Amino acid sequence: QFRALLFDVQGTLTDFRSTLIEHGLSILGDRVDRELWEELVDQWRGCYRDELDSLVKQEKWRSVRAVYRDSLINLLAKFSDSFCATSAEVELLTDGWERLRSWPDVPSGLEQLRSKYLVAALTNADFSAIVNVGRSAKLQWDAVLSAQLFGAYKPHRSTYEGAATLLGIAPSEILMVASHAYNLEAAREVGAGTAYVRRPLEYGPTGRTEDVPDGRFDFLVDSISELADQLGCPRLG
Amino acid sequence: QFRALLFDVQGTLTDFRSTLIEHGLSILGDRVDRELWEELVDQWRGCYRDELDSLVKQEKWRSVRAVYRDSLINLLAKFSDSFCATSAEVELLTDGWERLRSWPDVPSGLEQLRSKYLVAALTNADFSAIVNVGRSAKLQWDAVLSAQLFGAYKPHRSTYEGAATLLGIAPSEILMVASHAYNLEAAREVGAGTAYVRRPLEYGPTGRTEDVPDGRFDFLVDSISELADQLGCPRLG
Known part of the structure; x- marks a missing residue:
């Protein structure tokens, strides 16, 4: 058949959830607590789904790594009172989606x-x-x-x-x-x-x-x- | 690096030579001798190389299965005194290039x-x-x-x-x-x-x-x- x-x-x-949770803690260490990074991961996945849905409705495509990268930069600004990341660390964290x-x-x-x-x-x-x-x-x-x-x-x-x-x-x-x-x-x-x-x-x-x-x-x-x-x-x- | x-x-x-030689012999059997079918395989690959070379200069692409099939039909016309094959056998013979x-x-x-x-x-x-x-x-x-x-x-x-x-x-x-x-x-x-x-x-x-x-x-x-x-x-x- x-x-x-x-x-x-x-x-x-x-x-991907457990992958990206333990990926960020390994990179960010004690600068961020587990409870808060799990919530960023969830919002991260949610921004990816919202963006792709928008791009599907537009019949547009763009790099999904750029989707993950840009949506993390936006979340980091929202979570910037609790912790911070360098531009290099931003790339390493995004790399977690290629280490599922x-x-x-x-x-x-x-x-x-x-x-x-x-x-x-x-x-x-x-x-x-x-x-x-x-x-x-x-x-x-x-x-x-x-x-x-x-x-x-x-x-x-x-x-x-x-x-x-x-x-x-x-x-x-x-x-x-x-x-x-x-x-x-x-x-x-x-x-x-x-x-x-x-x-x-x-x-x-x-x-x-x-x-x-x-x-x-x-x-x-x-x-x-x-x-x-x-x-x-x-x-x- | x-x-x-x-x-x-x-x-x-x-x-590919050994693959397509024994592939066609199994399909055509005693209808064609080995030495004469081995010579068709060589010309077959050459017609494929000549066609792709022609398509590269034209900056054209077309299905390579169609390239093998069409160049097989042309050889069958060239060898039409010695042996013959049905259109079904032509597809099975062409399939040998996907069984390498x-x-x-x-x-x-x-x-x-x-x-x-x-x-x-x-x-x-x-x-x-x-x-x-x-x-x-x-x-x-x-x-x-x-x-x-x-x-x-x-x-x-x-x-x-x-x-x-x-x-x-x-x-x-x-x-x-x-x-x-x-x-x-x-x-x-x-x-x-x-x-x-x-x-x-x-x-x-x-x-x-x-x-x-x-x-x-x-x-x-x-x-x-x-x-x-x-x-x-x-x-x-």
Whole structure:
């Protein structure tokens, strides 16, 4: 039925919240407390989502590293009574988005899927970032696709459709994998299969997550391994 | 010095001659003898090189699968006294270029390089083909680049430069690896490093290959592993 699985990366396969929290504390040290840096990370991710949504509505693209970098400079000004950062440290902190750590089910899950399927990443992150993230998150791909190649961000149909022609595959023979329900419904409209992955800690324990019911998508799983088990991929020794 | 290694695929990492010879014989069987089909393969590659060379001067791109297919149809017209093939068999024969086998030094050599460098494919083949070849040639990349993404073939400078911006890398921080000396010289022009890999059996045992002397390129090796050793990459267990 399926020849390839297209994967969302940030959140679906990677714990960016814990990554960026421990990334900033390691750089900033005691100049900022943990409780306050966790709140900057949350607002950081929120500024990225608000900006991309705005750029999608404008049908515009720009570097996601510039999106992270600019939105951190704006938050640092808002948090400037509590702590401070140099221009060099601003770049090092932004680099944390290219050092994402994967969820413990992802590397072995990806390995299990390759026995019958091609696996490729389709992220809004810049091409350089997802290549880097592959090292820090131990993601192993047949192909790496970014919103940078298509000039537009998900859920724009040019991204999903473009990924299909580049891979030589029909959308109906691609399984889109994401922990974000809105952009999974957009894969459905272009004709792709849909697999939702529950990530209760994507936005932390205090985060409200999307309640998705059984039957809305083709698959509903808590781990890539489970998805591989449901697709008929044999487990690893 | 180098942050990424960009690799030629067809010939540099893959024994396409042996792949396509045994591929067509399995499809055409006794309808064609080996010595006569081996001569078609050689002309096939040459029609591909002539067409791409023509398209580079025109600053045109078109699907390399269509290039292989069309140049196969022309050879079949040339060989129409000796044997014949259906349109279905034409597609299966063309599929042999997406089922290439690697030289035995390539998979472990690429893996050895990944300890210190990013490795990416930069082939004139269409994006779908190199994805397939990754399975048949056992190639594992941080990134996969094709002339299809840039609208131009190697050795056009838009390809090398585009691969640099996509990876976040300066051309001077890219090491181009190829078994074809002419297109290696253009990487040098854009500012990239140059590594030549001798493939004496690329065009068969009785085939004439590019004889490259010491000093023309930055590296001159008989295997990907050898290149990794010269780049300071620790060996594999």
